[PDB]
Amino acid sequence: EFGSFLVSLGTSFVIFVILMLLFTWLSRKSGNAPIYYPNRILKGLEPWEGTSLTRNPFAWMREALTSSEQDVVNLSGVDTAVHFVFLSTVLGIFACSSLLLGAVYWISLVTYFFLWKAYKHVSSLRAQALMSADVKPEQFAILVRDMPAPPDGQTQKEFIDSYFREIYPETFYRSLVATXXXXXXXXXXXXXXXXXXXXXXXXXXXXXXXXXXXXXQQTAAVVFFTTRVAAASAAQSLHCQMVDKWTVTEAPEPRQLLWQNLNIKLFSRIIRQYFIYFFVAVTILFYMIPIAFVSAITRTVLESFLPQIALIVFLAMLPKLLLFLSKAEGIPSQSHAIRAASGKYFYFSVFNVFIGVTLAGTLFNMIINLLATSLPKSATFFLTYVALKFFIGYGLELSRIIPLIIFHLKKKYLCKTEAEVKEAWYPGDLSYATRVPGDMLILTITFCYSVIAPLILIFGITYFGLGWLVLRNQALKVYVPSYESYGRMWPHIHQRILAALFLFQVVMFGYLGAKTFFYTALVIPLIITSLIFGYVCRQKFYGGFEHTALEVACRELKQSPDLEEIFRAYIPHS
Amino acid sequence: EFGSFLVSLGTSFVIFVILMLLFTWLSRKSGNAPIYYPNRILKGLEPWEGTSLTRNPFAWMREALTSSEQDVVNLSGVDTAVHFVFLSTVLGIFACSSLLLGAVYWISLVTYFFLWKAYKHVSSLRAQALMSADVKPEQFAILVRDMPAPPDGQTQKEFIDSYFREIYPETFYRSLVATXXXXXXXXXXXXXXXXXXXXXXXXXXXXXXXXXXXXXQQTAAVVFFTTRVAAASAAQSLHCQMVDKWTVTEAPEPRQLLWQNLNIKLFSRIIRQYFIYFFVAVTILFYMIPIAFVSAITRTVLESFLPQIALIVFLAMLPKLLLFLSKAEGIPSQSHAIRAASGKYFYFSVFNVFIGVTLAGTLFNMIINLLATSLPKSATFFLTYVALKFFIGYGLELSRIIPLIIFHLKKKYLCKTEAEVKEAWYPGDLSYATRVPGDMLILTITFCYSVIAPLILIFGITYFGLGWLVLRNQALKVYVPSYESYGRMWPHIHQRILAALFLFQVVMFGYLGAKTFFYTALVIPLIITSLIFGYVCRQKFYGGFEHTALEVACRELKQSPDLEEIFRAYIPHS
Ligand SMILES: CCCCC/C=C\C/C=C\CCCCCCCC(=O)O[C@H](COC(=O)CCCCCCCCCCCCCCC)COP(=O)([O-])OCC[N+](C)(C)C
Ligand SMILES: CCCCC/C=C\C/C=C\CCCCCCCC(=O)O[C@H](COC(=O)CCCCCCCCCCCCCCC)COP(=O)([O-])OCC[N+](C)(C)C
Numbered sequence A, B: 001e002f003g004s005f006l007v008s009l010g011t012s013f014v015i016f017v018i019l020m021l022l023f024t025w026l027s028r029k030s031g032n033a034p035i036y037y038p039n040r041i042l043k044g045l046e047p048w049e050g051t052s053l054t055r056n057p058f059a060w061m062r063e064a065l066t067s068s069e070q071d072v073v074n075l076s077g078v079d080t081a082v083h084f085v086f087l088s089t090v091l092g093i094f095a096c097s098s099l100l101l102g103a104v105y106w107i108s109l110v111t112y113f114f115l116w117k118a119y120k121h122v123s124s125l126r127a128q129a130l131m132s133a134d135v136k137p138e139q140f141a142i143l144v145r146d147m148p149a150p151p152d153g154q155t156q157k158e159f160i161d162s163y164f165r166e167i168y169p170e171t172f173y174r175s176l177v178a179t180x181x182x183x184x185x186x187x188x189x190x191x192x193x194x195x196x197x198x199x200x201x202x203x204x205x206x207x208x209x210x211x212x213x214x215x216x217q218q219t220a221a222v223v224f225f226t227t228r229v230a231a232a233s234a235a236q237s238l239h240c241q242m243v244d245k246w247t248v249t250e251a252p253e254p255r256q257l258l259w260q261n262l263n264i265k266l267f268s269r270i271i272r273q274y275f276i277y278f279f280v281a282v283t284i285l286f287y288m289i290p291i292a293f294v295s296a297i298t299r300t301v302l303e304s305f306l307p308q309i310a311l312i313v314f315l316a317m318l319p320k321l322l323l324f325l326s327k328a329e330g331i332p333s334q335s336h337a338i339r340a341a342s343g344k345y346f347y348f349s350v351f352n353v354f355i356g357v358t359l360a361g362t363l364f365n366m367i368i369n370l371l372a373t374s375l376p377k378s379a380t381f382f383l384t385y386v387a388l389k390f391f392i393g394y395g396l397e398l399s400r401i402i403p404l405i406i407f408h409l410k411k412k413y414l415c416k417t418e419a420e421v422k423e424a425w426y427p428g429d430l431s432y433a434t435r436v437p438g439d440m441l442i443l444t445i446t447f448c449y450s451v452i453a454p455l456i457l458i459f460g461i462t463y464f465g466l467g468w469l470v471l472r473n474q475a476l477k478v479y480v481p482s483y484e485s486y487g488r489m490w491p492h493i494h495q496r497i498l499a500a501l502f503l504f505q506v507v508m509f510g511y512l513g514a515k516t517f518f519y520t521a522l523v524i525p526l527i528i529t530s531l532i533f534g535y536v537c538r539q540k541f542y543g544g545f546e547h548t549a550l551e552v553a554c555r556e557l558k559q560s561p562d563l564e565e566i567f568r569a570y571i572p573h574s
C-alpha cells in the first residue's frame, strides 16, 4: 500500500538521519572512542589520522572511499576483503541492469560476466593471501576420526601412533587424542570472604572433574606433520581400505576446532545428519506460520512497521538455532559450522521468505492473469524491508547506539577494574553467520523481482552501495576477526548468487508464461546455461578453495617452524 | 502370444541341446583343444586333468562346480572373480524372492541384504588382492594433464621437470611427455619380390613420419615416483591453485593407457563431454525407432524369432559406437572407457529396451485399469528373450562353434606359419564392455517384473545360475584377461543393481497405484530407503575402490623396484 510505503520510508529515513547526526556528533567525542574506533584502539592506532583534532563531519566517507582492497586485507583479513568483493560484485551487476532498465538475458549475461570475473578475482586474491602467509599450526596438521578401538593390552594413543608411524615413518611428529566436558565446566567455575570459600570449592570440583577426564575409548586425534607439504598431502589421502576407519581431513585452525564433536563416529554422524536435516526441514515447515502472519498483516501504524518487525523477530532467532544444529551434526570446525548455518538459513530465505511471503501475499488477492498481476505488488513490502535495513539497520550499525548505551552503563555501575571495562567494549567480529545470510536474502528478492517490479533494483543498488560504504567504515574502524578462513566462504557465496540467478531465470520462465508470452521457451537456454556455467566454474576454480596447492605449500620458509608450539596450540584447558 | 512362446522355447531348447552335444563330442577331440581349452594351453596346462583320456561327458560340470572363488582369482584375476560375485549375488536374490513367490518389501530387503554383504565381500576381496600384489609400473606413477605452455627459451619437458621437482624434490624420477599418430600408422605399415619393395617403401614412410613426430607444444606427461606411497599421495593431491593447470590423477595400467587422448585440454574435454553426451542422448532418441519395430512385430515364424533377432542386431552395434564415443571424450584409460561405455549402454537398457519395449507394447493394447492389465503381458517377450540368451547364447558360448569354424578355415587355407595359426585361435578376454551391459539388461527386466509377471523370476534364476556354470567353465578354460582393474568394476555394478531396484520400487509404487491400491504410499519409504542405502554404502565402501589405501601402499617390499623398467613400460613404439 502506497501511503504506508511512504510512511515507512519516511520514518526509516528520518531515523537514519538522526542516527547519522548522533554518529557525527558522538564519534568526534573522545570518550566514545572505545565504541567508534575499537579496531584501531586494539591495534595501537590513533582513533583517526587527521591530528588537527577538528574532524570534518564527512571525513569518514572520504577515508572509506579512498581505501583499496589491499588496505582492507592488510588491516582486517581476507575474509573481510571477500565480503567487500561480494558487496561490490552485486552492486556492479545491479547498476548494469538498471542502465538497461529480453532484460532477462541482459541481466543473466551481466551476472555471468561478473560472477566469472569475481570468482577469478577472488581465486587470485586467495592465492596471493596464501602465498604470503606466515607459519601457522593448521598448516602442519590433520584431523583423524573414526579410529577403531585398540586391541587388548594397548591404549588408544599407542594405537594411533602405531598406525600413522607405519604409513608416514619419517614425517610424523605427534598425535593428540581428543579426550572432558565435566572438567571444562568445573574448571570454568574455578576460574570465575564467602566468595573465596566458593572459589576454593570450585577449584576442588575442578580437580575431581579433571580426574574423571583422566579416567576417560576415544575415536579421534589431531596429527602433526613436520612439513606443510606432508600435511597437505596426508589430508588429501585415503589411509585404509575400509573407508570408515581412520578417516582424515585437514585440521581446523586451533581457534575453530569444535572439540566436543570429534568423537562422534561416522555412522553416528550420518544418523545425526539425517535427524538434523530432518528437523530443519520440519522447522522450515513450522516457520510457514510466522510467515503467514507477516503476509496477512501487509492501520498505517501496523502496516508500516509490524510486518517488518515481526519478520525481523522471527528470522532473528534462526542463526542461533541453526548454528547449534550445525554443531550438533558432528562438524569439526567453526567456519564450517557457520557456512552450514548460512546454508540452512538460505533454505529459509528461499522457502519461508521469498517464496513464503510472495506466495502468501499472492493468495490474498483468467486465474493465471490475476496471479501475474498480483505477484509484482509484493515488491512494495520488500522495498520497505530493504530500506528498513539500509536506513535503520545501517543507521544503528554505524552509530552504534545500542553498544554505546550498554557500555557506559556497565562502565559506571558494574565494572570495577580496567579489565572489566575493556571486556565491556570488545567489538566482536563481523558475524558472518548472520550477516552473509542477511545479504543473501536481499539478493534473492532483488534478483527475483528485477524485471517484475524493477524499482527494486534501485533499492538493491542502494542497499549494496550504502552497505559497501557503511561496512567499509566498520571493517576498518570497528570489527575484529575471530578466525581466518582465507576466502573459503567465496564458493558458498558464488553458488548462492548463482542459485539466486537460477531461481530468477526459473521465475521469469514461469512469469513470462503467466503473461502467456510466446517465447518463454527462449529462457530455457538460460536455465541450462546457468547450470553449465556453475559446472564449468566449479571445474575451473572450486578445488583451489578446498586445499592449499602444493605449489603454495612448497613456499620457501622464512625460518624452520617450532613444532612443539604448533602442538601446544591445539591443547585446550592447559 | 502362447503358441509363439512355446515355439521359441522349443527351438532355443533344441538348439541348446544340439550345441551341448556338439560340445560334448568336439571338446573331447584333441584337435579342437586350441578352441575349447586355450586358457589352459596358454598357461602351459594340460587341456584337462583326468589323464585317463576317457573324459566323462559331465566332467566339466563337476569341475566348474567344485571350484572356489579363490581358484577363479588365482587362475583368471580379480575382475573375473568379481564377475562371479555379480552373477551369484543376483542368483541369491532371485532365489530368495521365489521362495516367497508386500513381496516388494521382501525383495527389497533381500536385495539390500545381499548388496550390503556383496559389497562388503568384494571390498574384502579387493583389499586382499591389492594386499598381495606384486610390483607393477602403475603403482609408481601419475598422469599429469593440462600443462601450460612453457616460457620462451624452455621446452615442454624441461618445464614439467621443473614444476614437479620443486614440489617433490626427492621423490621424483621421470617425466614422459605424451608426444605421433602418423608415426604409429606408418610404423605399423612397416612392421606389416614386390612385397619386399613394398616393405622398403613402408619403412621409408615410417622414418618420415617419425621425423614429423620428433618435430612435434604438448600438454600431458606421465610422471614417475620412487615409491608407491608417494605416487599414491601425489595422485590424490592438488598441485596448483589454478585448478585447470597441471591436473593430476593415478596413471592407468600401461596396457590401458589411451595415449591419443592425453593432450586434450580440460576445456576441450568439457566441450567434448557435452557434445558426446548430447550425441548419445540423440542416439537414444533415434533408437526409439528400432525399438518400435521390435515391439510392433510381437506368423509364428516371425513372432518367435524376428523381434528377438532384430533387437539383438540393433543392440549389438552399440558397444562399438559407445566405446568409440567414450574414448572420444578424452578418457585416459581403457577400463574407464569401458565402464563409461557400459554406463551409456545402461541408459539404452533403461530407455530403449525396458521402458521402450514395455511402453510400446502397452500402447498396442478405465484407461488406468487397461494399462495395468496390459503391462504384464510384455513379460512373455522378455521370457523368450532371456531364454534365447541362456539357451542359444550360452549354447554358442560353451560350444564355440563359430570360433571353431573360422579357426579351422584359417588354419587350412590362410595360415602359412605357426605364428599365424596361433593368432587365429587367440581367445580374447571376457569382453566386459558387452558382457556386463548384457547381464545388466537381464536384471533390469527381471527386477522390474518380479512381482508383476513373477514367472520371469524363474527365468532370471536360470539365466544367472546357468550363466554361472557356463561362464565358470569359460573363465577357467577359455578366456584370457587383457587388463586388471582389481574390482574397480564393482561400484559400477553395485550402483546399477541398486538403480534397478530403485526403478523396481518406483515401478511398483506406480503399478500398485494403477491397481488403485490403498497403501501404495508404503512403498515411498522403500524408495527413500534405497537412496539412503546407496548413500550409506557409498560412504562406507566406495572410496576404497578409487584409491589404494596408504596402509596397502606401505606394504613391505619383496625387493626394490626397478624404476627404469617401470619407465620403459610406458613408452609406446620403442
Ligand atoms: C539508470 C542507472 C544509472 C547509473 C547506475 C546506478 C548506480 C551506480 C552505483 C554505484 C557505482 C558502481 C560501482 C561498480 C564496481 C564493480 C567492481 C568492484 O569490485 O568495485 C570495487 C568497489 O567500488 C565501489 O563500488 C564503491 C562504492 C562507493 C559507496 C556508495 C555507492 C552508491 C550508494 C548510494 C545511492 C545510489 C547513487 C548512484 C549514483 C549514480 C573497486 O575495488 P576497491 O575496493 O579496491 O577500491 C575502492 C575505491 N578506490 C579505487 C577509490 C580506492
Ligand atoms: C520356490 C523356489 C525354490 C528354491 C529356489 C530356486 C532356485 C535356486 C538356484 C540356485 C542355488 C542358490 C545359490 C545362492 C548363492 C549366493 C552366495 C554366493 O556368492 O554363492 C557362490 C556361488 O554358488 C552358486 O550359486 C553355484 C551355482 C551352480 C550352477 C547351477 C545353478 C542353477 C541353474 C539351473 C536351473 C534352476 C534349478 C534350481 C533347483 C532348486 C559361492 O561361492 P564360491 O564361488 O567360492 O563356491 C562355489 C561352490 N563350491 C563351494 C562347491 C566350490
Ligand SMILES: CCCCCCCCCCCCCCCCCC(=O)OC[C@@H](O)COP(=O)(O)OCCN
Pocket (backbone or CB within 6 Å): A277, A278, A280, A281, A284, A285, A288, A339, A340, A341, A342, A343, A344, A347, A351, A492
Ligand atoms: C502439504 C505440504 C505443504 C508444504 C508447503 C511448503 C513448501 C516449501 C518447503 C521446503 C523444505 C526444504 C527442506 C530442505 C533444506 C534443509 C536440509 C539441509 O539443511 O541440508 C541440505 C545440505 O545442502 C546442507 O549443506 P551445507 O552444510 O550448508 O554446506 C555448506 C558448505 N558446502
Ligand SMILES: CCCCCCCCCCCCCCCCCC(=O)OC[C@@H](O)COP(=O)(O)OCCN
Pocket (backbone or CB within 6 Å): B277, B278, B280, B281, B284, B285, B288, B339, B340, B341, B342, B343, B344, B347, B351, B492
Ligand atoms: C517429444 C519427446 C519424446 C521422448 C521419448 C523418449 C524418452 C526417453 C529418453 C531418455 C534420454 C536419456 C539421456 C541421458 C543419458 C546419456 C548421457 C551420458 O552418457 O552421460 C551421463 C553420465 O552419467 C555418464 O557417466 P559414466 O562415464 O558412465 O561413469 C562410469 C564410472 N563412474
Ligand SMILES: CCCCCCCCCCCCCCCC(=O)O
Pocket (backbone or CB within 6 Å): A016, A017, A020, A021, A024, A057
Ligand atoms: C540520504 C542522505 C541523508 C543525509 C544523512 C547524513 C547527514 C549528516 C550531516 C552532518 C552535518 C554536520 C555539520 C557540522 C559542522 C560542524 O562541525 O560545525
Ligand SMILES: CCCCCCCCCCCCCCCC(=O)O
Pocket (backbone or CB within 6 Å): A018, A022, A029, A030, A031, A032, A401, A404, A405, A408
Ligand atoms: C535520540 C538519542 C537517543 C540515544 C541517547 C544519546 C545520548 C548520549 C548517550 C551516550 C552517553 C555518552 C555521551 C558522551 C560522553 C562524552 O562526552 O565523552
Ligand SMILES: CCCCCCCCCCCCCCCC(=O)O
Pocket (backbone or CB within 6 Å): A109, A112, A113, A116, A117, A525, A526, A529
Ligand atoms: C542462452 C545462451 C547464453 C550463453 C551466455 C554465456 C556467456 C559467457 C559467460 C561470461 C564469460 C565472461 C568472460 C570474461 C573473460 C575475462 O575478462 O577474463
Ligand SMILES: CCCCCCCCCCCCCCCC(=O)O
Pocket (backbone or CB within 6 Å): A088, A089, A092, A096, A106, A109, A110, A113, A114, A117, A118, A121
Ligand atoms: C551483458 C553485458 C556484459 C558486459 C558488462 C560490462 C560492465 C562494465 C565493465 C566492468 C569491468 C570491471 C570488472 C570487475 C570484476 C569484479 O571485480 O567483480
Ligand SMILES: CCCCCCCCCCCCCCCC(=O)O
Pocket (backbone or CB within 6 Å): A267, A270, A271, A274, A275, A278, B532, B536
Ligand atoms: C528422520 C529419519 C532419520 C533417518 C536416519 C537414517 C540413518 C542411516 C544410518 C545408517 C547407519 C549404518 C551403520 C553401519 C555400521 C557398519 O556396518 O559398520
Ligand SMILES: CCCCCCCCCCCCCCCC(=O)O
Pocket (backbone or CB within 6 Å): A273, A274, A277, A278, A281, A282, B535
Ligand atoms: C523432512 C525431509 C528432510 C530431507 C533431508 C535430506 C538430507 C539428505 C542428506 C544427504 C545428502 C548428501 C550430504 C553430504 C554432506 C557431507 O558431505 O557430509
Ligand SMILES: CCCCCCCCCCCCCCCC(=O)O
Pocket (backbone or CB within 6 Å): A274, A275, A277, A278, B528, B531, B532, B534, B535, B538
Ligand atoms: C530424513 C531422511 C531423508 C529423506 C530424503 C532422502 C534423501 C536421500 C539422500 C541421498 C544422497 C545420495 C548422494 C550420493 C550419490 C550416490 O549414491 O552416488
Ligand SMILES: CCCCCCCCCCCCCCCC(=O)O
Pocket (backbone or CB within 6 Å): A011, A305, A309, A312, A388, A389, A392, A393, A396
Ligand atoms: C515512529 C514509530 C516507530 C516504530 C518502530 C520504529 C521503526 C522500527 C525500527 C525497529 C526495528 C529496527 C530493526 C532494524 C535492524 C535490523 O535489521 O535488525
Ligand SMILES: CCCCCCCCCCCCCCCC(=O)O
Pocket (backbone or CB within 6 Å): A343, A350, A491, A492, A495, A496, A499, A502, A503, A506
Ligand atoms: C527452482 C530453484 C530453487 C532455488 C534454491 C536452490 C537451493 C540450493 C542452494 C545451492 C546448493 C549448492 C550445493 C553444492 C554444495 C555446497 O553448498 O557447497
Ligand SMILES: CCCCCCCCCCCCCCCC(=O)O
Pocket (backbone or CB within 6 Å): A116, A524, A525, A526, A528, A529, A532, A533, A536
Ligand atoms: C543452452 C545450451 C548451451 C549453453 C552453453 C553455456 C556455456 C557457457 C559456460 C561459461 C563459460 C565462460 C568461459 C569464458 C572464458 C573466456 O572467454 O575468457
Ligand SMILES: CCCCCCCCCCCCCCCC(=O)O
Pocket (backbone or CB within 6 Å): B016, B017, B020, B021, B024, B057
Ligand atoms: C536342460 C538340460 C538339457 C540337457 C543338455 C545336456 C545334454 C548333454 C548330454 C551328454 C550325454 C553324452 C553321453 C555319451 C557317453 C559316451 O561317452 O559314450
Ligand SMILES: CCCCCCCCCCCCCCCC(=O)O
Pocket (backbone or CB within 6 Å): B018, B022, B029, B030, B031, B032, B401, B404, B405, B408
Ligand atoms: C550342426 C553342426 C554344425 C556345425 C558343424 C560341426 C562339424 C565339425 C566342424 C569343425 C571341424 C573340426 C572337426 C574336428 C577335427 C578333429 O577330429 O580333430
Ligand SMILES: CCCCCCCCCCCCCCCC(=O)O
Pocket (backbone or CB within 6 Å): B109, B112, B113, B116, B117, B525, B526, B529
Ligand atoms: C521402509 C524401511 C526399510 C528399511 C530396511 C533396511 C534394512 C537394512 C539393510 C540390510 C543390512 C544387512 C546387514 C548384514 C550385516 C552382516 O551380515 O554383516
Ligand SMILES: CCCCCCCCCCCCCCCC(=O)O
Pocket (backbone or CB within 6 Å): B088, B089, B092, B096, B106, B109, B110, B113, B114, B117, B118, B121
Ligand atoms: C528379507 C530376508 C533377508 C534374509 C535373506 C537370507 C538369505 C540366506 C542367507 C545367505 C547367507 C550367505 C551370504 C552371501 C553374501 C554374498 O556373498 O553375496
